[PDB]
Amino acid sequence: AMIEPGSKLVMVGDSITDCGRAHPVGEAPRGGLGNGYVALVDAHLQVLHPDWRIRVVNVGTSGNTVADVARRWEDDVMALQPDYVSLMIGVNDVWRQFDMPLVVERHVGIDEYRDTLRHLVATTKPRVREMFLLSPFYLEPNRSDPMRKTVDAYIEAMRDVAASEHVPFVDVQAEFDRLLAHLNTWVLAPDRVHPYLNGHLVIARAFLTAVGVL
Amino acid sequence: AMIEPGSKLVMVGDSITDCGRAHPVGEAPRGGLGNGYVALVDAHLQVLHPDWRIRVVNVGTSGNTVADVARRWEDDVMALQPDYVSLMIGVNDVWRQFDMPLVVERHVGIDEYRDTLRHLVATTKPRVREMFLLSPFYLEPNRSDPMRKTVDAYIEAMRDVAASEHVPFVDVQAEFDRLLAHLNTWVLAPDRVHPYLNGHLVIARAFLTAVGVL
Ligand SMILES: [Cl-]
Ligand SMILES: [Cl-]
């Protein structure tokens, strides 16, 4: 799943991608990528593969569902002329159903989620070298917890789109499940959703492994 | 030079180590370790070796020379009953000679630096499983630059103290020199001294390699 030298990699998502990145566009120099997994991906590429000249860009936005991502996709993502795009999205699409159950217009149901991911992949894939779908995740080891069960269904929908569109799927949730057998969720996040540096390192390493750097 | 499971590792130094860590003592939970190499060391230990149960602690203090470290050693470092101690120090000892050349009581010359390091190792080694000396560094590839030449001399004084006491020496400066052949210093720091995340990852990986994790 190699990243060609001299390429621009645009990483898209919600707050976990955002991590305080610069506006309108987060770039590597200084701290413009924020302080989470996107900044860690860039740091590993520059420290281990500086000659690859990979330009990493962050356009994550806190609170986004896949509907928000789709609305801004051409202007915020494709206008940057990416060679590679990654997308992690879905935790908010599910979370709103639990933290705002009566505020139904904030919810994105699974059919809208799957259809919107399919459209984004279908329009993006012909214009990039590769697109990477990164699973949303929820740091709850009990897969019968209702929200965890719903997140797993959305992850499956993403996996199915990745398979049907033939783009790579990075199962970040599976990496957390392995780690949660050793560490309890409070070590990784204050709220099962937004990880500390440790969980951002899990995401970055999963992505870097998917692109053959680790 | 492995770290035995269930051990407390206290990391000491100047702002490079500090990185906004919590007072009076920086601990892992949340962001108490700051947002630099000490936090990255802890993150890798917990993600890759959670069963090791390594408690990482940060007592770095911005602006410290080795004289400042020695003054607070017993109360800030040894009182924590460390199993392992790391120390990176020296860049300020040198830098003050250049940024405040006439303010001589802020300078620490090489004989004082060497003798103070000797004393810190001598007093610590019998009380810990292992101590690690981490080179200070200066992100200037021209070895003839006067400050870079002086930093190199202090690094070699530290290396010689480590060899005399038979404690591990981690040559962080050498890892930066290799990377500086590929990336210019402005990619790594705004001032040749305080690195961005990329440089903190260089330091963390050098430490982790020295303890057998990478
Ligand atoms: Cl495992
Ligand atoms: Cl090399």
GROMACS .gro file of C-alpha atoms and ligand atoms in nm:
model
  430
    1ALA     CA    1   0.000   0.000   0.000
    2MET     CA    2   0.310   0.216  -0.052
    3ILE     CA    3   0.317   0.595  -0.058
    4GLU     CA    4   0.520   0.724  -0.358
    5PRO     CA    5   0.797   0.982  -0.291
    6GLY     CA    6   0.700   1.352  -0.322
    7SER     CA    7   0.335   1.286  -0.255
    8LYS     CA    8   0.075   1.487  -0.062
    9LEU     CA    9  -0.119   1.282   0.193
   10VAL     CA   10  -0.437   1.456   0.317
   11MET     CA   11  -0.578   1.310   0.638
   12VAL     CA   12  -0.946   1.376   0.705
   13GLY     CA   13  -1.178   1.307   0.995
   14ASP     CA   14  -1.333   1.444   1.316
   15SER     CA   15  -1.167   1.582   1.636
   16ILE     CA   16  -0.939   1.281   1.667
   17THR     CA   17  -0.794   1.366   1.327
   18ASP     CA   18  -0.819   1.747   1.394
   19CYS     CA   19  -0.630   1.756   1.727
   20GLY     CA   20  -0.603   2.136   1.710
   21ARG     CA   21  -0.461   2.153   1.357
   22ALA     CA   22  -0.419   2.490   1.184
   23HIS     CA   23  -0.690   2.660   0.975
   24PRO     CA   24  -0.785   2.674   0.695
   25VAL     CA   25  -0.536   2.386   0.634
   26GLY     CA   26  -0.305   2.199   0.880
   27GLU     CA   27   0.049   2.154   0.741
   28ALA     CA   28   0.357   1.985   0.894
   29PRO     CA   29   0.586   2.280   0.955
   30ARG     CA   30   0.590   2.386   1.321
   31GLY     CA   31   0.278   2.239   1.490
   32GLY     CA   32   0.033   2.279   1.217
   33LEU     CA   33  -0.076   1.914   1.212
   34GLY     CA   34  -0.196   1.929   1.572
   35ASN     CA   35  -0.076   1.698   1.850
   36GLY     CA   36  -0.230   1.358   1.765
   37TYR     CA   37  -0.199   1.071   1.522
   38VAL     CA   38  -0.169   1.282   1.206
   39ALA     CA   39   0.128   1.473   1.358
   40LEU     CA   40   0.275   1.135   1.468
   41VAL     CA   41   0.239   0.989   1.116
   42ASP     CA   42   0.422   1.290   0.974
   43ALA     CA   43   0.691   1.271   1.245
   44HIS     CA   44   0.760   0.903   1.169
   45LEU     CA   45   0.774   0.964   0.795
   46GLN     CA   46   1.019   1.253   0.835
   47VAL     CA   47   1.240   1.075   1.094
   48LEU     CA   48   1.247   0.733   0.928
   49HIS     CA   49   1.193   0.823   0.561
   50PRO     CA   50   1.294   1.188   0.513
   51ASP     CA   51   1.405   1.125   0.153
   52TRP     CA   52   1.046   1.025   0.061
   53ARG     CA   53   0.944   1.394   0.090
   54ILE     CA   54   0.590   1.313   0.197
   55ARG     CA   55   0.379   1.624   0.258
   56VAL     CA   56   0.124   1.542   0.528
   57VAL     CA   57  -0.183   1.766   0.562
   58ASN     CA   58  -0.459   1.760   0.824
   59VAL     CA   59  -0.815   1.876   0.750
   60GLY     CA   60  -0.989   1.701   1.040
   61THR     CA   61  -1.274   1.891   1.206
   62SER     CA   62  -1.407   1.830   1.559
   63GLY     CA   63  -1.767   1.706   1.577
   64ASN     CA   64  -1.795   1.600   1.212
   65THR     CA   65  -2.014   1.313   1.098
   66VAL     CA   66  -1.970   1.160   0.753
   67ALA     CA   67  -2.245   1.400   0.633
   68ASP     CA   68  -2.029   1.698   0.742
   69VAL     CA   69  -1.726   1.545   0.573
   70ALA     CA   70  -1.914   1.492   0.248
   71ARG     CA   71  -2.047   1.850   0.245
   72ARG     CA   72  -1.694   1.995   0.258
   73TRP     CA   73  -1.509   1.725   0.064
   74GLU     CA   74  -1.448   1.899  -0.269
   75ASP     CA   75  -1.353   2.234  -0.117
   76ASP     CA   76  -1.153   2.115   0.184
   77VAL     CA   77  -0.999   1.791   0.062
   78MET     CA   78  -0.997   1.753  -0.317
   79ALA     CA   79  -0.904   2.117  -0.383
   80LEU     CA   80  -0.572   2.043  -0.213
   81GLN     CA   81  -0.483   1.803  -0.500
   82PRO     CA   82  -0.399   1.506  -0.276
   83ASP     CA   83  -0.205   1.208  -0.403
   84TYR     CA   84  -0.336   1.004  -0.108
   85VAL     CA   85  -0.635   1.059   0.119
   86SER     CA   86  -0.715   0.894   0.451
   87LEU     CA   87  -1.051   0.914   0.626
   88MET     CA   88  -1.146   0.815   0.981
   89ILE     CA   89  -1.508   0.895   1.053
   90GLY     CA   90  -1.815   0.744   1.221
   91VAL     CA   91  -1.773   0.784   1.596
   92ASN     CA   92  -1.983   1.102   1.601
   93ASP     CA   93  -2.242   0.951   1.364
   94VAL     CA   94  -2.301   0.687   1.634
   95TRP     CA   95  -2.224   0.892   1.948
   96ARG     CA   96  -2.497   1.151   1.881
   97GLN     CA   97  -2.757   0.870   1.897
   98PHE     CA   98  -2.647   0.814   2.258
   99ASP     CA   99  -2.554   1.156   2.391
  100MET     CA  100  -2.841   1.341   2.216
  101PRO     CA  101  -3.099   1.064   2.163
  102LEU     CA  102  -3.393   1.301   2.108
  103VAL     CA  103  -3.200   1.545   1.883
  104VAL     CA  104  -3.253   1.322   1.585
  105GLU     CA  105  -3.127   1.560   1.317
  106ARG     CA  106  -2.772   1.523   1.461
  107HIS     CA  107  -2.781   1.145   1.405
  108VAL     CA  108  -2.649   0.969   1.096
  109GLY     CA  109  -2.798   0.621   1.057
  110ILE     CA  110  -2.610   0.328   0.918
  111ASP     CA  111  -2.759   0.335   0.568
  112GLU     CA  112  -2.676   0.705   0.525
  113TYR     CA  113  -2.329   0.635   0.669
  114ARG     CA  114  -2.259   0.344   0.430
  115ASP     CA  115  -2.400   0.529   0.126
  116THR     CA  116  -2.204   0.845   0.200
  117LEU     CA  117  -1.878   0.652   0.247
  118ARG     CA  118  -1.943   0.474  -0.083
  119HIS     CA  119  -1.996   0.804  -0.264
  120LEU     CA  120  -1.680   0.958  -0.113
  121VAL     CA  121  -1.472   0.658  -0.213
  122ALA     CA  122  -1.626   0.637  -0.559
  123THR     CA  123  -1.558   1.003  -0.641
  124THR     CA  124  -1.212   1.012  -0.478
  125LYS     CA  125  -1.050   0.684  -0.588
  126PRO     CA  126  -1.017   0.784  -0.959
  127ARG     CA  127  -0.838   1.108  -0.858
  128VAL     CA  128  -0.580   0.972  -0.613
  129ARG     CA  129  -0.310   0.708  -0.603
  130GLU     CA  130  -0.483   0.546  -0.304
  131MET     CA  131  -0.748   0.618  -0.042
  132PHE     CA  132  -0.731   0.466   0.306
  133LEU     CA  133  -1.041   0.404   0.519
  134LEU     CA  134  -0.952   0.407   0.889
  135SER     CA  135  -1.208   0.249   1.121
  136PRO     CA  136  -1.376   0.468   1.377
  137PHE     CA  137  -1.328   0.321   1.725
  138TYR     CA  138  -1.477   0.319   2.070
  139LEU     CA  139  -1.261   0.222   2.369
  140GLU     CA  140  -1.506  -0.019   2.527
  141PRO     CA  141  -1.398  -0.385   2.539
  142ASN     CA  142  -1.751  -0.516   2.602
  143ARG     CA  143  -1.885  -0.575   2.252
  144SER     CA  144  -2.238  -0.613   2.392
  145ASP     CA  145  -2.238  -0.256   2.525
  146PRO     CA  146  -2.504  -0.090   2.303
  147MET     CA  147  -2.286   0.189   2.173
  148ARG     CA  148  -1.990  -0.043   2.118
  149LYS     CA  149  -2.220  -0.282   1.927
  150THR     CA  150  -2.341   0.006   1.711
  151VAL     CA  151  -1.985   0.126   1.644
  152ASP     CA  152  -1.897  -0.230   1.537
  153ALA     CA  153  -2.188  -0.227   1.287
  154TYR     CA  154  -2.061   0.100   1.141
  155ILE     CA  155  -1.707  -0.038   1.122
  156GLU     CA  156  -1.848  -0.338   0.931
  157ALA     CA  157  -2.027  -0.099   0.689
  158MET     CA  158  -1.694   0.078   0.627
  159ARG     CA  159  -1.512  -0.252   0.580
  160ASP     CA  160  -1.779  -0.356   0.326
  161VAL     CA  161  -1.742  -0.030   0.130
  162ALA     CA  162  -1.360  -0.071   0.132
  163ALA     CA  163  -1.391  -0.423  -0.001
  164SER     CA  164  -1.648  -0.336  -0.271
  165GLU     CA  165  -1.452  -0.030  -0.389
  166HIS     CA  166  -1.113  -0.207  -0.352
  167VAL     CA  167  -0.945   0.041  -0.121
  168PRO     CA  168  -0.745  -0.039   0.192
  169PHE     CA  169  -0.920  -0.065   0.526
  170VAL     CA  170  -0.718  -0.007   0.844
  171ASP     CA  171  -0.882  -0.176   1.143
  172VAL     CA  172  -0.783   0.065   1.421
  173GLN     CA  173  -1.060  -0.074   1.645
  174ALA     CA  174  -0.899  -0.421   1.628
  175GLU     CA  175  -0.566  -0.276   1.744
  176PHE     CA  176  -0.738  -0.114   2.041
  177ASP     CA  177  -0.921  -0.436   2.122
  178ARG     CA  178  -0.588  -0.617   2.147
  179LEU     CA  179  -0.447  -0.343   2.371
  180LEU     CA  180  -0.758  -0.327   2.591
  181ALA     CA  181  -0.686  -0.690   2.690
  182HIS     CA  182  -0.375  -0.546   2.866
  183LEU     CA  183  -0.475  -0.191   2.966
  184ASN     CA  184  -0.807  -0.066   3.089
  185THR     CA  185  -0.983   0.207   2.896
  186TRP     CA  186  -0.909   0.479   3.154
  187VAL     CA  187  -0.538   0.456   3.067
  188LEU     CA  188  -0.623   0.533   2.701
  189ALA     CA  189  -0.893   0.805   2.720
  190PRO     CA  190  -1.103   1.007   2.967
  191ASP     CA  191  -1.430   0.921   2.788
  192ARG     CA  192  -1.382   0.610   2.569
  193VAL     CA  193  -1.365   0.832   2.256
  194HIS     CA  194  -1.076   1.082   2.262
  195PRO     CA  195  -0.742   0.912   2.332
  196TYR     CA  196  -0.435   1.040   2.508
  197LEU     CA  197  -0.098   1.034   2.331
  198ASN     CA  198  -0.076   0.657   2.384
  199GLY     CA  199  -0.396   0.594   2.183
  200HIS     CA  200  -0.284   0.839   1.915
  201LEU     CA  201   0.035   0.633   1.884
  202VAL     CA  202  -0.178   0.318   1.834
  203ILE     CA  203  -0.363   0.492   1.546
  204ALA     CA  204  -0.042   0.625   1.390
  205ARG     CA  205   0.133   0.287   1.408
  206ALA     CA  206  -0.171   0.114   1.253
  207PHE     CA  207  -0.168   0.360   0.964
  208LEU     CA  208   0.212   0.340   0.917
  209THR     CA  209   0.194  -0.041   0.917
  210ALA     CA  210  -0.080  -0.029   0.649
  211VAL     CA  211   0.154   0.182   0.426
  212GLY     CA  212   0.457  -0.044   0.485
  213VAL     CA  213   0.667   0.196   0.704
  214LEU     CA  214   0.634  -0.022   1.012
  215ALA     CA  215   2.017  -0.254   2.919
  216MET     CA  216   1.666  -0.369   3.003
  217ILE     CA  217   1.413  -0.219   3.236
  218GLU     CA  218   1.266  -0.476   3.479
  219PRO     CA  219   0.884  -0.494   3.502
  220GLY     CA  220   0.705  -0.282   3.765
  221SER     CA  221   0.984  -0.023   3.776
  222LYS     CA  222   0.978   0.356   3.819
  223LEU     CA  223   1.182   0.541   3.557
  224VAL     CA  224   1.248   0.906   3.652
  225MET     CA  225   1.356   1.121   3.355
  226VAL     CA  226   1.548   1.437   3.439
  227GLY     CA  227   1.676   1.733   3.242
  228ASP     CA  228   1.606   2.086   3.116
  229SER     CA  229   1.318   2.222   2.902
  230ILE     CA  230   1.379   1.944   2.643
  231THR     CA  231   1.284   1.692   2.913
  232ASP     CA  232   1.028   1.923   3.090
  233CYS     CA  233   0.802   1.996   2.791
  234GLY     CA  234   0.532   2.145   3.018
  235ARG     CA  235   0.519   1.851   3.260
  236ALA     CA  236   0.312   1.874   3.577
  237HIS     CA  237   0.438   2.013   3.910
  238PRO     CA  238   0.567   1.917   4.155
  239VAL     CA  239   0.609   1.581   3.969
  240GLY     CA  240   0.509   1.484   3.611
  241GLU     CA  241   0.332   1.145   3.594
  242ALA     CA  242   0.195   0.949   3.293
  243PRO     CA  243  -0.177   0.969   3.354
  244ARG     CA  244  -0.328   1.222   3.110
  245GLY     CA  245  -0.054   1.459   2.988
  246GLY     CA  246   0.132   1.489   3.310
  247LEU     CA  247   0.454   1.396   3.130
  248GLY     CA  248   0.431   1.689   2.892
  249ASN     CA  249   0.427   1.673   2.516
  250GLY     CA  250   0.781   1.566   2.419
  251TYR     CA  251   1.017   1.272   2.431
  252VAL     CA  252   0.939   1.163   2.789
  253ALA     CA  253   0.568   1.136   2.701
  254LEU     CA  254   0.661   0.948   2.380
  255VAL     CA  255   0.880   0.705   2.576
  256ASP     CA  256   0.589   0.634   2.811
  257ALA     CA  257   0.345   0.603   2.519
  258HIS     CA  258   0.563   0.342   2.345
  259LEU     CA  259   0.615   0.145   2.666
  260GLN     CA  260   0.244   0.130   2.734
  261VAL     CA  261   0.140   0.052   2.372
  262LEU     CA  262   0.409  -0.205   2.301
  263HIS     CA  263   0.485  -0.342   2.650
  264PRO     CA  264   0.183  -0.273   2.869
  265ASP     CA  265   0.254  -0.583   3.079
  266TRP     CA  266   0.596  -0.437   3.181
  267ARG     CA  267   0.412  -0.191   3.414
  268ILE     CA  268   0.674   0.083   3.370
  269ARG     CA  269   0.592   0.399   3.567
  270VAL     CA  270   0.749   0.691   3.381
  271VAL     CA  271   0.802   1.017   3.570
  272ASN     CA  272   0.922   1.356   3.444
  273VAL     CA  273   1.113   1.605   3.663
  274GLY     CA  274   1.271   1.811   3.383
  275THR     CA  275   1.296   2.187   3.443
  276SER     CA  276   1.332   2.454   3.172
  277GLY     CA  277   1.661   2.650   3.181
  278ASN     CA  278   1.849   2.407   3.409
  279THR     CA  279   2.220   2.357   3.387
  280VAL     CA  280   2.386   2.057   3.550
  281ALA     CA  281   2.449   2.279   3.857
  282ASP     CA  282   2.071   2.338   3.887
  283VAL     CA  283   2.005   1.967   3.847
  284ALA     CA  284   2.261   1.880   4.117
  285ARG     CA  285   2.112   2.134   4.364
  286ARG     CA  286   1.771   1.967   4.342
  287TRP     CA  287   1.880   1.606   4.289
  288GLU     CA  288   1.810   1.457   4.629
  289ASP     CA  289   1.476   1.628   4.679
  290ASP     CA  290   1.337   1.608   4.324
  291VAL     CA  291   1.488   1.284   4.193
  292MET     CA  292   1.614   1.048   4.465
  293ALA     CA  293   1.322   1.118   4.700
  294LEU     CA  294   1.099   0.953   4.436
  295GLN     CA  295   1.277   0.619   4.496
  296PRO     CA  296   1.350   0.560   4.128
  297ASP     CA  297   1.447   0.218   3.997
  298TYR     CA  298   1.593   0.384   3.687
  299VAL     CA  299   1.706   0.741   3.622
  300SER     CA  300   1.781   0.914   3.293
  301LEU     CA  301   1.950   1.250   3.262
  302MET     CA  302   1.987   1.474   2.956
  303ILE     CA  303   2.165   1.800   3.042
  304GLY     CA  304   2.431   2.032   2.906
  305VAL     CA  305   2.275   2.241   2.632
  306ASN     CA  306   2.207   2.532   2.872
  307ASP     CA  307   2.550   2.497   3.036
  308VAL     CA  308   2.696   2.570   2.691
  309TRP     CA  309   2.425   2.800   2.548
  310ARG     CA  310   2.457   3.060   2.827
  311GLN     CA  311   2.820   3.113   2.723
  312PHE     CA  312   2.689   3.229   2.383
  313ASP     CA  313   2.355   3.398   2.454
  314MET     CA  314   2.478   3.570   2.773
  315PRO     CA  315   2.858   3.583   2.725
  316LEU     CA  316   2.917   3.852   2.990
  317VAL     CA  317   2.679   3.706   3.251
  318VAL     CA  318   2.943   3.462   3.364
  319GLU     CA  319   2.763   3.326   3.675
  320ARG     CA  320   2.507   3.164   3.441
  321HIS     CA  321   2.781   2.965   3.263
  322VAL     CA  322   2.894   2.615   3.362
  323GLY     CA  323   3.242   2.539   3.221
  324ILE     CA  324   3.345   2.194   3.109
  325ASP     CA  325   3.537   2.104   3.425
  326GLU     CA  326   3.242   2.189   3.647
  327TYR     CA  327   3.008   2.009   3.405
  328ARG     CA  328   3.221   1.694   3.404
  329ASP     CA  329   3.279   1.696   3.779
  330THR     CA  330   2.908   1.749   3.852
  331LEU     CA  331   2.805   1.467   3.618
  332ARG     CA  332   3.064   1.242   3.787
  333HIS     CA  333   2.912   1.321   4.123
  334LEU     CA  334   2.551   1.266   4.006
  335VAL     CA  335   2.640   0.928   3.861
  336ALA     CA  336   2.846   0.827   4.167
  337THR     CA  337   2.567   0.913   4.409
  338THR     CA  338   2.287   0.760   4.199
  339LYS     CA  339   2.434   0.438   4.058
  340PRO     CA  340   2.442   0.254   4.396
  341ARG     CA  341   2.075   0.339   4.459
  342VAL     CA  342   1.921   0.242   4.125
  343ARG     CA  343   1.908  -0.059   3.894
  344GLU     CA  344   2.053   0.153   3.613
  345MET     CA  345   2.117   0.515   3.518
  346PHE     CA  346   2.114   0.640   3.156
  347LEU     CA  347   2.311   0.943   3.043
  348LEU     CA  348   2.149   1.104   2.735
  349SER     CA  349   2.367   1.338   2.534
  350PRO     CA  350   2.266   1.701   2.510
  351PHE     CA  351   2.241   1.809   2.146
  352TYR     CA  352   2.256   2.111   1.924
  353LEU     CA  353   2.097   2.100   1.580
  354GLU     CA  354   2.386   2.257   1.388
  355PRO     CA  355   2.550   2.029   1.132
  356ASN     CA  356   2.862   2.250   1.097
  357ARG     CA  357   3.097   2.094   1.352
  358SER     CA  358   3.327   2.397   1.330
  359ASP     CA  359   3.058   2.635   1.452
  360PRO     CA  360   3.193   2.746   1.791
  361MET     CA  361   2.885   2.658   1.995
  362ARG     CA  362   2.846   2.323   1.816
  363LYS     CA  363   3.213   2.246   1.886
  364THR     CA  364   3.163   2.327   2.253
  365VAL     CA  365   2.848   2.111   2.273
  366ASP     CA  366   3.048   1.824   2.117
  367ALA     CA  367   3.314   1.865   2.387
  368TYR     CA  368   3.052   1.847   2.662
  369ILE     CA  369   2.896   1.539   2.498
  370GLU     CA  370   3.235   1.370   2.500
  371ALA     CA  371   3.282   1.463   2.869
  372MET     CA  372   2.947   1.294   2.942
  373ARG     CA  373   3.047   0.990   2.734
  374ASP     CA  374   3.372   0.961   2.931
  375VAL     CA  375   3.189   0.986   3.267
  376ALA     CA  376   2.944   0.713   3.154
  377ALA     CA  377   3.231   0.489   3.047
  378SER     CA  378   3.417   0.539   3.379
  379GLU     CA  379   3.112   0.451   3.589
  380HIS     CA  380   2.995   0.183   3.352
  381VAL     CA  381   2.651   0.329   3.293
  382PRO     CA  382   2.480   0.347   2.951
  383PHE     CA  383   2.534   0.650   2.731
  384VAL     CA  384   2.271   0.732   2.466
  385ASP     CA  385   2.421   0.941   2.183
  386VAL     CA  386   2.117   1.143   2.087
  387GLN     CA  387   2.338   1.400   1.910
  388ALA     CA  388   2.464   1.126   1.671
  389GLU     CA  389   2.106   1.036   1.576
  390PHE     CA  390   2.040   1.399   1.496
  391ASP     CA  391   2.359   1.426   1.293
  392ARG     CA  392   2.243   1.134   1.077
  393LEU     CA  393   1.901   1.296   1.030
  394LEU     CA  394   2.053   1.640   0.956
  395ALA     CA  395   2.215   1.482   0.645
  396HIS     CA  396   1.856   1.443   0.513
  397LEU     CA  397   1.658   1.734   0.670
  398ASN     CA  398   1.782   2.084   0.735
  399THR     CA  399   1.773   2.214   1.089
  400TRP     CA  400   1.471   2.444   1.029
  401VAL     CA  401   1.254   2.132   0.982
  402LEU     CA  402   1.358   2.007   1.326
  403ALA     CA  403   1.357   2.324   1.545
  404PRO     CA  404   1.301   2.701   1.532
  405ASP     CA  405   1.629   2.778   1.709
  406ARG     CA  406   1.865   2.477   1.682
  407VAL     CA  407   1.784   2.378   2.043
  408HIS     CA  408   1.412   2.302   2.105
  409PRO     CA  409   1.283   2.041   1.859
  410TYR     CA  410   0.937   1.993   1.717
  411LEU     CA  411   0.755   1.660   1.758
  412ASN     CA  412   0.979   1.506   1.491
  413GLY     CA  413   1.294   1.572   1.701
  414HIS     CA  414   1.125   1.452   2.017
  415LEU     CA  415   1.050   1.126   1.835
  416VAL     CA  416   1.425   1.100   1.748
  417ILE     CA  417   1.510   1.132   2.119
  418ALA     CA  418   1.242   0.886   2.229
  419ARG     CA  419   1.342   0.625   1.974
  420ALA     CA  420   1.710   0.658   2.073
  421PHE     CA  421   1.619   0.598   2.437
  422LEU     CA  422   1.383   0.311   2.358
  423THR     CA  423   1.649   0.145   2.138
  424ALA     CA  424   1.902   0.177   2.424
  425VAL     CA  425   1.659  -0.014   2.655
  426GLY     CA  426   1.578  -0.285   2.396
  427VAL     CA  427   1.217  -0.184   2.307
  428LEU     CA  428   1.311  -0.080   1.952
  429CL      CL  429  -0.141  -0.879   2.158
  430CL      CL  430   2.107   0.704   0.807
   0.00000   0.00000   0.00000
